Amino acid sequence: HMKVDKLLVRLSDSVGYLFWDSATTGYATCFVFKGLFILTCRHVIDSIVGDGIEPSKWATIIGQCVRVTFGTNYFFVEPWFEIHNEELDYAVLKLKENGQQVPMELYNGITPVPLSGLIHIIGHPYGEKKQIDACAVIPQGQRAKKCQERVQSKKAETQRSFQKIVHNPDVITYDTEFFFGASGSPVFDSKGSLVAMHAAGFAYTYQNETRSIIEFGSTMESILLDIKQRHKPWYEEVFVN
């Protein structure tokens, strides 16, 4: 369908390339969540700050070492780091206005989480050009079976490893090229409505190729509930008011 394809091209203007150069250098994907606030994965912030830094200083380091481009066209973020979560692997940052127009926010209400079918992901695999990809949902009930099949096929040449996606309705699973460094990329359902944020996969190297057993992202519903419970005053000023 092309009306959805034209919609996803429009939405892709809200998907950003996050770059950092701190003690290390790297990139990730992010997207405008609500207003000036962007979303990315929590493990990305951990890579920016690195290990052994007091929490009082993360906001200053983030403000000093992060830049975001949605295309001199870039945004800094505010030295502010308060809404985030390790298990759901999300982090909110706030863009600093600089006269350039902020792209439209992508959170557009309570999209149902697709239990099967097709989803779309927008982001920057390999830290290169922005891409829009279509992926098939892997239903929850087939996750454990899919993982063992593919591990055994390779060994032909356990499930304690995968037991963070097995009974987790808070994630969608799928197979995507966005495994290659596009963590933080927003995930859309077949209508082009924001449903999730791509998180990670299960990396391994086989015949000198880096591959992944399965990929997953945390649902917007689970992220928003966490924000609603843990940061109710912030939720009401940003989402309600």
Author numbering: 343 to 413, 422 to 507, 516 to 599
What does the paper say about this structure?
FAM111A (FAM111 trypsin-like peptidase A) is a serine protease involved in multiple cellular processes including antiviral defense and DNA replication. FAM111A contains a serine protease domain (SPD) with a conserved catalytic triad (His385, Asp439, and Ser541). The FAM111A SPD belongs to the S1 family of serine peptidases, which includes chymotrypsin, in the MEROPS database. Here, we show that FAM111A is a dimerization-dependent protease containing a narrow, recessed active site that cleaves substrates with a chymotrypsin-like specificity.
Therefore, to generate a mutant SPD that would crystalize without forming the α1 dimer interface even at the very high concentrations used for crystallization, we truncated the N-terminal SPD to remove two-thirds of the dimer interface and included an engineered V347D mutation to create a construct that we have named mini-SPD. The mini-SPD crystallized with two polypeptide chains present in the asymmetric unit. Although helix α1 is still present and visible in the electron density map, the dimerization interface observed in the full SPD dimer structure is noticeably absent. Overall, the mini-SPD and SPD dimer structures possess a significant degree of similarity with an overall RMSD value of 0.5 Å, but with some small yet impactful differences. The catalytic triad Asp-His-Ser (in this construct the catalytic Ser541 was retained as wildtype) is unchanged, which is expected as they are anchored on the rigid beta-barrel domain. In contrast, several disordered regions were noted in the mini-SPD where some of the residues comprising the dimerization interface, several surface-exposed loops, and the oxyanion hole are altered. Residues 413-422 that form a part of the loop L4 between β4 and β5 were disordered and not observed in the mini-SPD. Another region adjoining the β6-β7 loop (Loop L6, residues 474-480) is also disordered in one chain and altered compared to the dimeric SPD in the other chain. The differences observed between the two chains of the mini-SPD structure and the dimeric SPD as well as the higher B-factors observed for residues 536–538 encompassing the oxyanion hole and S1 pocket indicate that the monomeric SPD is more disordered. This suggests that dimerization of the SPD is associated with a disorder-to-order transition that supports the oxyanion hole residues in the conformation that is competent for catalysis.
